[PDB]
Write a protein that binds this ligand. Structure first.
Ligand SMILES: CCN1BC=CC=C1
Ligand code: NA
Length: 164
């Protein structure tokens, strides 16, 4: 297990434009296209991202290319954020993957409300952090995924992703 395999489990792989859990147009391995309700706007974003006129359909290689860019962007975003970087730096590599997962799903300022969780994680108060992380819209709307990510933060193991 690693961040790529983890997010591949959590996001799936679909080669045609679909709507994500929030109803937003997405493709590939959780590549958010736009929050616009316009399918045409989504298709334009796709063409821009891939560099060709798609039919709203991409190849697996193309999906994986966007995925690698998106993982890289999530990490880069953490490192550029004054609140996130010190906590991320304090973590072991398994828990760093859990952090990247959250930023991939919600965005860097979408984790803005996790101040208290962040403190508990830097303190390595893992059970307390896990309890706090679950007190969130995130957990309520995507509980199975959040439970896996939270277990990863609680334990520093890949146990929640085994047999998946
Ligand atoms: C709240 C979990 N995270 B996210 C980004 C960096 C460090 C910890
Ligand atoms: Na998805």
């Amino acid at each position: 297990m690693n961040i790529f395999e983890m997010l591949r489990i959590d996001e799936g792989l679909r080669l045609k434009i679909y709507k994500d859990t929030e109803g937003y147009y997405t493709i590939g391995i959780g590549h958010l296209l736009t929050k616009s309700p316009s399918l045409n706007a989504a298709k334009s974003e796709l063409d821009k991202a891939i560099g060709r006129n798609t039919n709203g359909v991409i190849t697996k290689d193309e999906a994986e290319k966007l995925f690698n860019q998106d993982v890289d962007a999530a990490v880069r975003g953490i490192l550029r954020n004054a609140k996130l970087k010190p906590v991320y730096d304090s973590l072991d590599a398994v828990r760093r993957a859990a952090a990247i997962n959250m930023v991939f799903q919600m965005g860097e300022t979408g984790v803005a409300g996790f101040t208290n969780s962040l403190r508990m994680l830097q303190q390595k108060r893992w059970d307390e952090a896990a309890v706090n992380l679950a007190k969130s819209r995130w957990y309520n709307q995507t509980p199975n995924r959040a439970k896996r990510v939270i277990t990863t933060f609680r334990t520093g193991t890949w146990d929640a992703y085994k047999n998946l």
